[PDB]
Design a protein around this ligand. Structure first.
Ligand SMILES: O=C(O)Cc1ccc(O)c(-c2ccccc2)c1
Ligand SMILES: [Zn+2]
Ligand SMILES: [Zn+2]
Length: 585
């Protein structure tokens, strides 16, 4: 293993030779531990509270989920505890027959995904534009420095030689440029998967990349129209830890469709940074805090460019395999067989594969499958054997599916069909309300002015106006936040890093105009393009559904807050000062 990773550790060892030591009482069991060096204190045991959102959501000061979110441990102590849980494990190797099916399915899937698109290298300019648009700090400074790009060139030259010297994944500018440079090289070689939308629904059939949260429910309702069994949405326990060396070698097959110069750089990313990896992990000690240098040959690096797409790929593959087993194409004897006949697997893929892909909605480790019947519920041999063991259920207990797409969990949400006063239907995203309120009450980091705090609060409010307007308490709180924050103040900072967030709320444009554009004009499931002229015509969930999904409507504390919200708004206004405000109540 040292032939591939040695140079990287050598550069860390040499850079930190002042404090480099081998801590013989390190906690690593399944990862190779190489050494440690002293560092400063990074992360916090608690998160800063957004005073603007908190002041305007008084009834939720007494809500347990809201309090839990106000915590989240990011210190070296919190980093170590989550590591032991799933990260520090080994996945048993799949059986030979299982490995054969995965190989036939991966080959077929990559050809299918590349039927119209050709892989290509991503550029310094694309990465720069991406860094810039997402920064509006030290990443934008690095991108504007010519010396960073000269380091990129030097690392690339090693990659072309099949060597790596600085590509280290993490759990002043010297080590920082090595990290961003590692991400740029990864982006250069594998970025086409995201940039050229290989996992869009049109390209992948099962994929939802670029669709947006506002389209996922409609996609689930369309899947519900396909004849078959129940809709299954099984959660895998720590998906990234279950990515095997066999999965990595199947994912690598995309390089076969690349141009020689691209193939060379993607192969270096696959072989030196995915199939071999050097990781930095913070750890507290009685002496203080150290940074551990560890390595392994399998699993997925969660904070990588290709992670989403390669997880989507491997999950589409794993679900097709489960679908085959449910249909009796794959038996127990087939999975143990090192001489498994390809014919019936190839025939099923060529005749049914695309139709079987359309029965799914797959976003990384998140999947929804509507099989041809319910034999799938008990088709667990290949799923467990591939290492994709379901969370919190005995390995061999049949999966429980749903007969109503509206009950199906997907991407931390469920989706409701609403009837508007004019008879038109909307399919909206929803989640337990405490999770939405709890998230909005948190400000990222510290040292943020009231101005910056109010603008993030405004971002949360406008996200609720656009995605969660159907929740009575969220429309009320949203109107209260937007009434309390100056009209011309632009929402700054993101409400989420979700791949499904299109951030249509990151504006000073009128929210009802934005609502109309998203839900009416640009909505392909809205045949009638008549604009909604008032929020009075923007529907709510049925009162009972709003309550089942966490609404405090019907409670006294809620009626008191609603009646007295102009007072709290006026308090936020007086602390912000003499600015232009609009009353949305
Ligand atoms: O990415 C995921 O798996 C789910 C997820 C999580 C958090 C979110 O804030 C959102 C989200 C909210 C509003 C608009 C778009 C996306 C989605
Ligand atoms: Zn490298
Ligand atoms: Zn709901």
């Amino acid at each position: 293993n040292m032939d591939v990773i040695g140079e990287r550790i050598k550069r860390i060892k040499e850079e930190h030779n002042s404090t480099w030591h081998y801590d013989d009482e390190n906690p690593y069991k399944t990862w190779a531990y190489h050494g440690s060096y002293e560092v400063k204190a990074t992360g916090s045991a608690s998160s800063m509270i957004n005073g603007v959102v908190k002041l305007l959501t008084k009834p939720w000061d007494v809500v347990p989920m809201v309090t839990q979110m106000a915590m989240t441990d990011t210190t070296p102590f919190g980093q170590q505890r989550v590591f032991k849980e799933k990260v520090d494990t080994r996945t048993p190797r799949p059986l030979p027959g299982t490995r054969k099916v995965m190989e036939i399915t991966a080959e077929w899937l990559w050809r299918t995904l590349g039927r119209n698109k050709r892989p290509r290298l991503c550029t310094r300019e694309e990465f720069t534009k991406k860094v810039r648009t997402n920064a509006a700090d030290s990443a934008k400074a690095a991108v504007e420095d010519e010396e960073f790009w000269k380091l990129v060139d030097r690392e690339r030259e090693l990659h072309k030689l099949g060597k790596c010297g600085s590509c280290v994944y993490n759990m002043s500018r010297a080590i920082w440029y090595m990290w961003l440079g590692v991400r740029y090289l990864e982006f250069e070689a594998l970025g086409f998967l995201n940039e050229d939308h290989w996992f869009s629904r049109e390209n992948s059939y099962s994929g939802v990349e670029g669709e947006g949260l506002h389209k996922l429910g409609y996609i689930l309702r369309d899947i519900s129209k396909i004849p078959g069994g129940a809709m299954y949405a099984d959660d895998t326990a720590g998906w990234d830890t279950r990515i095997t060396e066999d999965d990595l070698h199947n994912e690598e097959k995309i390089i076969q469709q690349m141009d020689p110069e691209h193939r060379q750089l993607a192969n270096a990313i696959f072989k030196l940074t995915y199939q071999n990896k050097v990781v930095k992990v913070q750890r507290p000690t009685p002496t203080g805090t150290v940074m551990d240098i560890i390595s392994r040959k399998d699993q997925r690096g969660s904070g990588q460019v290709g992670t989403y797409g390669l997880n989507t790929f491997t999950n589409m593959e794993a679900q097709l395999v489960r679908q085959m087993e449910g249909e009796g194409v794959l038996t127990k004897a087939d999975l143990e067989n090192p001489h498994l006949l390809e014919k019936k697997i190839t025939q099923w893929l060529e005749t049914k594969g695309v139709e079987r892909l359309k029965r799914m909605a797959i976003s990384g480790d998140d999947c929804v499958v509507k099989p041809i019947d319910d034999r799938f519920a008990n088709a667990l041999l290949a799923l467990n054997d591939m290492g994709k063991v379901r969370k919190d259920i005995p390995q061999w207990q049949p999966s429980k599916g749903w007969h109503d797409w509206q009950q199906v969990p997907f991407c931390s949400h469920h989706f409701h069909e609403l009837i508007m006063k004019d008879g038109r239907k909307l399919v909206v995203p929803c989640r337990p309300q405490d999770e939405l309120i709890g998230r909005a009450r948190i400000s990222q980091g510290a040292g943020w002015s009231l101005r910056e705090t109010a603008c993030l609060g405004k971002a949360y409010a406008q996200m609720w106006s656009l995605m969660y307007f159907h929740r009575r308490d969220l429309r009320l709180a949203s109107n209260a936040i937007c009434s309390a924050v100056p009209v011309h103040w632009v929402p700054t900072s993101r409400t989420t890093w979700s791949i499904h967030a299109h951030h249509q709320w990151m504006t000073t444009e009128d929210m009802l105009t934005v609502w109309n554009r998203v839900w009416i004009e640009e909505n392909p499931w809205m045949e009638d393009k008549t604009p909604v002229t008032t929020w009075e015509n923007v529907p709510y969930l049925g009162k009972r559904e709003d309550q089942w999904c966490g609404s405090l409507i019907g409670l006294t504390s809620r009626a008191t807050w609603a009646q007295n919200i102009p007072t709290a708004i006026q308090q936020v206004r007086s602390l912000i000062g003499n600015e232009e405000f609009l009353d949305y109540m």
